[PDB]
Amino acid sequence: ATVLLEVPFSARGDRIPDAVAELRTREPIRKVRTITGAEAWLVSSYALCTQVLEDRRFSMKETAAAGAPRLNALTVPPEVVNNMGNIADAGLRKAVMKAITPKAPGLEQFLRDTANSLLDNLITEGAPADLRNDFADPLATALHCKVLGIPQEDGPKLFRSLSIAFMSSADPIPAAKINWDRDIEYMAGILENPNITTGLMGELSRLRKDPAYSHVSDELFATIGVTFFGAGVISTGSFLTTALISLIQRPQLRNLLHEKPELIPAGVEELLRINLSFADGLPRLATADIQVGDVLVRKGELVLVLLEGANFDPEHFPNPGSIELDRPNPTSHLAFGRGQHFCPGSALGRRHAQIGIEALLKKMPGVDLAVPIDQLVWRTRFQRRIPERLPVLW
Ligand code: HEM
Ligand SMILES: O=C1N[C@@H](Cc2ccc(O)cc2)C(=O)N[C@H]1Cc1ccc(O)cc1
Ligand SMILES: [C-]#N
């Protein structure tokens, strides 16, 4: 006898398990056990993943309810699971979105300058270099300090909360609350700091004193800073890191993009499609009985939307494992989700990766792994799949 299939399948972000395609073909919605011991429905086909994400009766907010089956333990206050809903209800969605656009004046130039400086420092120190800790993550951290309007020198300490904040744990994490409370206190101080007049926090600081927003709590304003820093930095840094691995292992694509950088956006879009950076399915709690494929999901049950299930589905993306730059449906992947909770940072995340890759290909055209790929150490029990170090030479 065997136990119920357990999720997640593998923390490795450099290859998709063969089990995904078998599940998708045989049982594209099927019962699994999460790290907490709860049962859940794992959805792995494009059609069913999109169905769940487009039906608000599969609720993100309700995953935080006491007594619900859990994918993992909360690392934020339960109300923050509904963060974007709270932002929208406060009338702040448009202002937040405008602050985090990659098109802000001078932003793209700042990111290129930062990428080029990071790379120059690695070249000066000499191979091997660690492209995660000394390139992708610092680039993400610098980008988000600039977007938020906060001092660059405050970035590293905020970043160091993230190895705990984005854990995927069976049990509550005491360090997560320590860091959360401290980071909230930091953002609350930023809102009171007269030097902070630009970026997202500069705009929230002004809206906070605007009578049209007098209802909104200081709690929400500080929470926006902590959450957009954390989600943005973890996702952009982790995506760029694993995209760099995908690129390094494809020297002909690396060369094609180096020779024709105008194809970088189409390349990044395919790297997004094939990306394994999300370590768990996206969770939703059913608020009604809802038929999904062959399964009547029952009110109160947990559903997990496996992004690589959808994104490697051959019925939607023929030859799904291949990077094809001329697909008819190129942004139709689920790397940024779909529906009510579609990523508000999608444009910033695309541009971060495009600029990072453009800079790396110009400065390090001969970039290659400096260790055999199996030697990468994949972080476990975390909400992203990332190598602890990414050693390269050039
Ligand atoms: C390559 C980079 C990124 C990727 C792959 C990514 C991926 C995702 C995905 C898949 C979701 C949907 C979550 C769900 O439906 O449960 C999401 C939502 C979200 N993302 Fe990102 N994201 C990226 C960058 C960013 C950035 C740069 C920011 C902010 C600065 C950000 C902030 C958020 C927030 C706040 C949500 C919740 C939206 C809501 O609940 O309506 N993300 N992201
Ligand atoms: O739970 C949330 N928490 C924050 C994201 C977040 C999670 C942890 C943390 O320490 C900071 C931010 C949110 O904005 N909405 C929700 C949903 C979410 C989760 C992860 C993620 O990457 C994006 C969204
Ligand atoms: C987005 N995290």
Coordinates of C-alpha atoms and ligand atoms in Angstrom, one line a residue:
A1 CA 0.0 0.0 0.0
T2 CA 1.0 3.6 -0.7
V3 CA 0.0 7.0 0.7
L4 CA -1.8 9.7 -1.2
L5 CA 0.4 11.5 -3.8
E6 CA 2.2 14.4 -2.0
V7 CA 2.9 17.9 -3.3
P8 CA 5.2 19.5 -4.3
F9 CA 6.9 16.9 -6.5
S10 CA 10.4 18.4 -6.7
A11 CA 12.2 21.6 -5.7
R12 CA 14.4 21.4 -8.8
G13 CA 13.7 24.4 -11.1
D14 CA 15.8 23.2 -14.0
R15 CA 13.5 20.5 -15.3
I16 CA 9.8 19.5 -15.2
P17 CA 9.1 16.1 -13.6
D18 CA 7.7 13.5 -16.0
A19 CA 4.8 13.1 -13.5
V20 CA 3.3 16.4 -14.6
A21 CA 2.5 15.2 -18.1
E22 CA 1.3 11.8 -16.9
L23 CA -1.1 13.5 -14.4
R24 CA -2.2 16.0 -17.0
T25 CA -3.1 13.2 -19.5
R26 CA -4.6 10.8 -17.0
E27 CA -6.1 12.9 -14.2
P28 CA -5.9 16.6 -14.8
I29 CA -7.7 17.2 -11.5
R30 CA -6.8 14.8 -8.8
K31 CA -6.5 14.6 -5.0
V32 CA -3.1 15.2 -3.3
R33 CA -1.8 15.8 0.2
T34 CA 0.0 19.0 1.1
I35 CA 2.9 19.5 3.5
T36 CA 0.4 20.3 6.3
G37 CA -1.4 17.0 5.9
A38 CA -4.5 18.5 4.3
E39 CA -6.0 17.1 1.1
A40 CA -6.3 19.2 -2.0
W41 CA -7.3 19.0 -5.7
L42 CA -4.3 19.5 -8.0
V43 CA -5.3 21.0 -11.4
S44 CA -2.7 20.5 -14.2
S45 CA -4.3 21.1 -17.6
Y46 CA -4.5 24.5 -19.3
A47 CA -8.2 24.3 -19.7
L48 CA -8.9 23.4 -16.0
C49 CA -6.3 25.8 -14.6
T50 CA -7.9 28.7 -16.5
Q51 CA -11.4 27.6 -15.4
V52 CA -10.4 27.7 -11.8
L53 CA -8.5 31.1 -12.0
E54 CA -11.4 32.7 -13.9
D55 CA -14.1 31.6 -11.4
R56 CA -14.1 33.9 -8.4
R57 CA -16.1 31.3 -6.5
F58 CA -12.6 29.7 -6.1
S59 CA -11.5 32.3 -3.6
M60 CA -8.0 33.5 -2.7
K61 CA -9.3 35.4 0.3
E62 CA -11.0 32.4 1.8
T63 CA -7.8 30.3 1.9
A64 CA -7.0 32.2 5.1
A65 CA -10.1 31.1 6.9
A66 CA -9.6 29.4 10.2
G67 CA -10.0 25.7 10.0
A68 CA -9.6 25.5 6.2
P69 CA -7.4 22.8 4.6
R70 CA -4.1 24.6 4.1
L71 CA -1.3 24.3 1.4
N72 CA 1.1 25.8 4.0
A73 CA 1.1 28.0 7.1
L74 CA 0.4 31.7 6.8
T75 CA 3.5 34.0 7.0
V76 CA 1.4 37.2 6.9
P77 CA -1.7 38.3 8.8
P78 CA -4.8 36.6 7.4
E79 CA -6.2 39.9 6.1
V80 CA -3.1 40.3 3.9
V81 CA -4.1 37.2 1.9
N82 CA -6.7 39.6 0.5
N83 CA -4.0 42.3 0.0
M84 CA -5.0 43.5 -3.5
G85 CA -8.7 43.3 -2.6
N86 CA -8.0 45.6 0.3
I87 CA -6.0 47.9 -1.9
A88 CA -8.8 48.0 -4.4
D89 CA -11.5 48.6 -1.7
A90 CA -9.5 51.6 -0.4
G91 CA -9.5 53.1 -3.9
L92 CA -5.8 52.8 -4.3
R93 CA -5.5 50.2 -7.2
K94 CA -4.9 52.8 -9.9
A95 CA -2.3 54.7 -7.9
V96 CA -0.4 51.6 -7.0
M97 CA -0.4 50.3 -10.6
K98 CA 0.8 53.7 -11.9
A99 CA 3.7 53.7 -9.4
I100 CA 4.9 50.2 -10.4
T101 CA 5.0 50.7 -14.2
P102 CA 8.3 50.1 -15.9
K103 CA 7.7 53.2 -18.1
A104 CA 8.4 55.7 -15.4
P105 CA 10.9 58.3 -16.6
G106 CA 14.5 57.2 -16.1
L107 CA 13.5 53.9 -14.6
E108 CA 14.7 51.6 -17.4
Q109 CA 17.9 53.6 -17.6
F110 CA 18.4 53.2 -13.8
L111 CA 18.0 49.4 -14.2
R112 CA 20.4 49.1 -17.1
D113 CA 23.0 51.2 -15.2
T114 CA 22.5 49.0 -12.1
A115 CA 22.8 45.8 -14.1
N116 CA 25.9 47.0 -15.9
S117 CA 27.5 48.1 -12.7
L118 CA 26.8 44.7 -11.0
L119 CA 28.2 42.9 -14.0
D120 CA 31.3 45.1 -14.1
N121 CA 32.0 44.4 -10.5
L122 CA 31.8 40.6 -11.1
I123 CA 34.1 40.9 -14.1
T124 CA 36.6 42.9 -12.1
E125 CA 36.6 40.3 -9.3
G126 CA 37.0 37.4 -11.8
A127 CA 35.2 34.1 -12.3
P128 CA 33.5 32.3 -10.8
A129 CA 30.6 34.6 -10.1
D130 CA 27.3 33.9 -8.3
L131 CA 24.6 35.3 -10.6
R132 CA 21.9 34.9 -8.0
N133 CA 23.4 36.5 -4.9
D134 CA 25.6 39.0 -6.8
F135 CA 23.4 39.8 -9.8
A136 CA 19.7 38.8 -10.1
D137 CA 18.7 39.4 -6.5
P138 CA 20.6 42.7 -6.0
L139 CA 19.1 43.9 -9.3
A140 CA 15.6 43.0 -8.1
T141 CA 16.3 44.7 -4.7
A142 CA 17.6 47.9 -6.3
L143 CA 14.7 48.0 -8.8
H144 CA 12.2 47.8 -6.0
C145 CA 13.9 50.4 -3.8
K146 CA 13.7 52.7 -6.7
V147 CA 10.1 51.9 -7.5
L148 CA 9.1 52.4 -3.9
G149 CA 11.1 55.6 -3.4
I150 CA 13.1 54.3 -0.5
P151 CA 16.9 54.5 0.0
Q152 CA 19.0 51.9 -1.8
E153 CA 20.9 51.2 1.3
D154 CA 17.8 50.0 3.1
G155 CA 17.2 47.3 0.4
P156 CA 19.6 44.5 1.7
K157 CA 18.0 44.3 5.2
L158 CA 14.5 44.2 3.7
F159 CA 15.6 41.6 1.2
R160 CA 17.0 39.4 4.0
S161 CA 13.5 38.9 5.4
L162 CA 12.5 37.1 2.2
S163 CA 14.2 33.7 2.7
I164 CA 11.8 33.3 5.6
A165 CA 8.8 35.3 4.5
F166 CA 8.3 33.1 1.4
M167 CA 8.8 29.8 3.1
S168 CA 6.3 27.1 2.4
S169 CA 6.0 25.6 5.8
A170 CA 3.7 23.1 7.5
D171 CA 3.7 25.3 10.7
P172 CA 3.8 29.0 11.6
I173 CA 7.2 30.6 11.5
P174 CA 8.2 32.7 14.5
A175 CA 10.9 34.6 12.5
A176 CA 8.3 35.6 9.9
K177 CA 6.4 37.6 12.5
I178 CA 9.5 39.2 13.9
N179 CA 10.6 40.3 10.4
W180 CA 7.0 41.3 9.4
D181 CA 6.5 43.5 12.4
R182 CA 9.9 45.2 11.9
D183 CA 9.4 45.7 8.2
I184 CA 5.9 47.2 8.8
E185 CA 7.5 49.6 11.4
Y186 CA 10.1 50.6 8.8
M187 CA 7.4 51.3 6.1
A188 CA 5.4 53.3 8.7
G189 CA 8.4 55.4 9.3
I190 CA 8.9 55.9 5.6
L191 CA 5.4 57.3 5.4
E192 CA 6.3 59.9 8.1
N193 CA 9.7 60.7 6.5
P194 CA 9.6 64.1 4.7
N195 CA 12.5 63.0 2.4
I196 CA 10.3 60.3 0.8
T197 CA 8.5 62.1 -2.0
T198 CA 9.0 59.8 -5.0
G199 CA 7.9 56.4 -6.0
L200 CA 5.1 54.3 -4.6
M201 CA 5.8 55.3 -1.0
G202 CA 6.1 58.9 -1.9
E203 CA 2.6 58.7 -3.5
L204 CA 1.1 56.8 -0.6
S205 CA 2.5 59.3 1.7
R206 CA 0.7 62.1 -0.1
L207 CA -2.5 60.2 -0.5
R208 CA -2.4 59.4 3.3
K209 CA -2.8 63.2 4.0
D210 CA -5.4 63.8 1.3
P211 CA -8.9 64.1 2.7
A212 CA -10.3 61.8 0.0
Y213 CA -8.3 59.0 1.6
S214 CA -8.8 59.9 5.3
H215 CA -10.6 56.6 5.8
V216 CA -7.7 54.4 4.9
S217 CA -5.6 53.1 7.8
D218 CA -1.9 53.6 8.3
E219 CA -1.8 49.8 8.6
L220 CA -2.8 49.4 5.0
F221 CA -0.4 52.1 3.7
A222 CA 2.6 50.4 5.4
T223 CA 1.4 46.9 4.3
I224 CA 1.4 48.0 0.7
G225 CA 5.1 48.9 1.0
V226 CA 6.1 45.6 2.7
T227 CA 4.1 43.4 0.4
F228 CA 5.0 45.0 -2.9
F229 CA 8.7 45.0 -2.0
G230 CA 8.5 41.4 -0.9
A231 CA 6.4 39.9 -3.7
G232 CA 8.1 41.9 -6.4
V233 CA 11.7 41.2 -5.2
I234 CA 11.1 37.5 -4.6
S235 CA 9.4 37.0 -7.9
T236 CA 11.6 39.1 -10.2
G237 CA 14.8 37.9 -8.5
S238 CA 13.7 34.2 -8.6
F239 CA 12.4 34.4 -12.2
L240 CA 15.5 36.1 -13.5
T241 CA 17.7 33.6 -11.7
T242 CA 16.0 30.5 -13.2
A243 CA 15.6 32.2 -16.6
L244 CA 19.4 32.7 -16.7
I245 CA 19.8 29.0 -16.1
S246 CA 17.4 28.2 -18.9
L247 CA 19.3 30.6 -21.2
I248 CA 22.8 29.3 -20.2
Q249 CA 21.7 25.8 -21.0
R250 CA 20.7 26.9 -24.5
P251 CA 23.8 28.4 -26.1
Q252 CA 22.2 28.8 -29.5
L253 CA 19.4 30.8 -28.0
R254 CA 21.9 32.7 -25.9
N255 CA 23.8 33.5 -29.2
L256 CA 20.7 34.3 -31.1
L257 CA 19.6 36.8 -28.5
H258 CA 23.1 38.2 -28.2
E259 CA 23.2 38.7 -32.0
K260 CA 19.6 40.0 -32.3
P261 CA 18.7 41.6 -29.0
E262 CA 15.4 42.8 -30.6
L263 CA 14.1 39.3 -30.0
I264 CA 14.8 39.5 -26.2
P265 CA 11.1 40.3 -25.3
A266 CA 9.9 37.3 -27.3
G267 CA 12.6 35.2 -25.6
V268 CA 11.7 36.5 -22.1
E269 CA 8.0 35.7 -22.9
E270 CA 9.0 32.1 -23.7
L271 CA 11.3 31.9 -20.6
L272 CA 8.2 33.1 -18.6
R273 CA 6.1 30.4 -20.1
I274 CA 8.6 27.6 -19.3
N275 CA 9.5 29.0 -15.9
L276 CA 9.4 26.7 -12.8
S277 CA 9.9 29.5 -10.3
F278 CA 6.6 29.0 -8.5
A279 CA 7.1 26.0 -6.2
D280 CA 3.5 25.3 -5.3
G281 CA 0.2 25.5 -7.2
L282 CA -1.7 28.7 -6.7
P283 CA -4.2 28.0 -3.8
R284 CA -8.0 28.7 -3.9
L285 CA -10.8 27.7 -1.6
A286 CA -14.1 26.6 -3.1
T287 CA -17.0 28.7 -1.8
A288 CA -19.6 26.5 -3.6
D289 CA -19.9 23.1 -5.1
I290 CA -18.3 23.4 -8.6
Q291 CA -17.7 20.8 -11.3
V292 CA -14.1 20.9 -12.6
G293 CA -13.5 18.2 -15.2
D294 CA -14.5 14.9 -13.8
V295 CA -14.6 16.2 -10.1
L296 CA -17.3 18.0 -8.3
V297 CA -15.2 20.1 -6.0
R298 CA -17.1 20.7 -2.7
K299 CA -17.5 23.9 -0.8
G300 CA -14.6 24.3 1.7
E301 CA -12.1 22.3 -0.3
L302 CA -8.6 23.5 -1.4
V303 CA -7.7 23.6 -5.0
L304 CA -4.1 24.1 -6.3
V305 CA -3.6 25.5 -9.8
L306 CA -0.3 24.1 -11.1
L307 CA 1.1 26.8 -13.4
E308 CA 3.6 24.5 -15.1
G309 CA 0.7 22.1 -15.7
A310 CA -1.0 24.7 -17.8
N311 CA 2.2 26.2 -19.3
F312 CA 3.6 22.8 -20.6
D313 CA 0.2 21.6 -21.8
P314 CA 0.7 20.3 -25.4
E315 CA -2.9 21.0 -26.3
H316 CA -2.3 24.7 -25.8
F317 CA 1.5 25.0 -26.5
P318 CA 2.5 22.5 -29.1
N319 CA 6.0 21.1 -28.4
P320 CA 5.7 22.6 -24.9
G321 CA 9.3 22.0 -23.8
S322 CA 10.8 24.0 -26.7
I323 CA 11.4 27.7 -26.7
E324 CA 9.7 28.9 -30.0
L325 CA 9.9 32.6 -30.5
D326 CA 7.0 32.7 -33.1
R327 CA 4.1 31.1 -31.2
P328 CA 0.6 32.3 -32.2
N329 CA -0.4 32.6 -28.5
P330 CA 2.8 33.9 -26.8
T331 CA 1.5 35.8 -23.8
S332 CA -1.4 33.3 -23.2
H333 CA 0.7 31.4 -20.6
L334 CA -0.2 31.6 -16.9
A335 CA 3.2 32.8 -15.5
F336 CA 1.4 35.9 -14.1
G337 CA -1.8 34.1 -13.2
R338 CA -5.2 34.9 -14.8
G339 CA -8.4 36.6 -13.8
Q340 CA -9.2 38.5 -10.6
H341 CA -5.7 38.1 -9.2
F342 CA -3.6 38.6 -12.4
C343 CA -0.2 39.9 -11.3
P344 CA -0.1 43.8 -11.1
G345 CA 3.6 43.7 -11.5
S346 CA 3.7 41.8 -14.8
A347 CA 5.0 44.7 -16.8
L348 CA 7.7 45.5 -14.3
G349 CA 8.7 41.8 -14.1
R350 CA 9.0 41.5 -17.8
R351 CA 11.2 44.6 -18.1
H352 CA 13.4 43.6 -15.2
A353 CA 14.2 40.3 -16.9
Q354 CA 14.6 41.8 -20.3
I355 CA 17.1 44.4 -19.1
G356 CA 18.9 41.9 -16.9
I357 CA 19.3 39.5 -19.8
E358 CA 20.3 42.2 -22.3
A359 CA 23.0 43.5 -20.0
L360 CA 24.4 40.0 -19.2
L361 CA 24.6 39.1 -22.9
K362 CA 26.5 42.3 -23.7
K363 CA 28.9 42.0 -20.8
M364 CA 29.3 38.2 -20.6
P365 CA 28.6 36.8 -24.1
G366 CA 30.5 33.6 -23.1
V367 CA 28.6 33.1 -19.9
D368 CA 28.3 29.4 -18.9
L369 CA 27.8 27.4 -15.7
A370 CA 31.0 27.0 -13.7
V371 CA 29.7 23.7 -12.1
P372 CA 27.8 20.8 -13.5
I373 CA 24.1 21.6 -13.5
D374 CA 23.3 18.8 -11.0
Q375 CA 25.5 20.6 -8.4
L376 CA 23.1 23.5 -8.0
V377 CA 21.5 23.4 -4.6
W378 CA 17.7 23.9 -4.8
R379 CA 16.0 25.6 -2.0
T380 CA 13.4 23.4 -0.3
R381 CA 10.1 24.1 1.5
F382 CA 9.9 27.6 -0.2
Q383 CA 7.3 29.3 -2.3
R384 CA 9.8 29.6 -5.2
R385 CA 12.3 27.2 -6.7
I386 CA 15.7 28.8 -6.8
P387 CA 19.3 27.6 -6.6
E388 CA 21.1 28.8 -3.5
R389 CA 24.1 29.9 -5.6
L390 CA 24.4 30.2 -9.4
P391 CA 28.2 29.8 -10.1
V392 CA 29.1 31.0 -13.6
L393 CA 32.2 31.7 -15.7
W394 CA 32.5 33.7 -18.9
Ligands
HEM1 C1 8.6 37.8 -13.1 C2 8.0 38.4 -12.1 C3 6.6 38.0 -11.5 C4 6.0 36.8 -11.6 C5 6.3 35.5 -12.3 C6 4.7 36.9 -10.8 C7 3.8 36.0 -10.7 C8 2.5 36.2 -10.1 C9 1.4 35.3 -10.1 C10 1.4 33.9 -10.8 C11 0.4 35.9 -9.4 C12 -1.0 35.3 -9.2 C13 -1.1 34.8 -7.8 C14 -2.5 34.1 -7.6 O1 -3.3 34.2 -8.5 O2 -2.6 33.4 -6.5 C15 0.9 37.2 -9.0 C16 0.1 38.1 -8.2 C17 0.7 39.2 -7.6 N1 1.9 39.8 -7.9 FE1 3.3 39.0 -9.0 N2 4.7 38.2 -10.2 C18 5.9 38.9 -10.7 C19 6.2 40.2 -10.4 C20 5.6 41.0 -9.5 C21 6.0 42.3 -9.1 C22 7.2 43.0 -9.7 C23 5.1 42.7 -8.2 C24 5.0 44.1 -7.4 C25 6.0 45.0 -7.4 C26 4.2 41.7 -7.9 C27 3.1 41.8 -7.0 C28 2.1 40.9 -7.0 C29 0.8 41.0 -6.2 C30 0.6 42.1 -5.2 C31 0.0 40.0 -6.5 C32 -1.4 39.7 -5.9 C33 -2.4 40.2 -7.0 C34 -3.8 40.0 -6.5 O3 -4.1 39.3 -5.5 O4 -4.8 40.5 -7.2 N3 4.5 40.6 -8.7 N4 2.2 37.4 -9.4
LIG2 O1 -0.9 36.3 0.7 C1 -0.6 37.3 0.1 N1 0.5 38.1 0.5 C2 0.9 39.3 -0.3 C3 2.3 38.9 -1.0 C4 3.3 38.7 0.1 C5 3.5 37.6 0.8 C6 4.4 37.5 1.8 C7 5.1 38.6 2.2 O2 6.0 38.5 3.2 C8 5.0 39.7 1.5 C9 4.1 39.8 0.4 C10 -0.1 39.8 -1.3 O3 0.1 40.9 -1.8 N2 -1.2 39.0 -1.7 C11 -1.5 37.7 -1.1 C12 -1.4 36.6 -2.2 C13 0.0 36.5 -2.7 C14 0.9 35.6 -2.3 C15 2.2 35.5 -2.8 C16 2.6 36.3 -3.7 O4 3.9 36.2 -4.2 C17 1.7 37.3 -4.2 C18 0.4 37.4 -3.7
LIG3 C1 4.0 38.1 -7.5 N1 4.5 37.6 -6.5

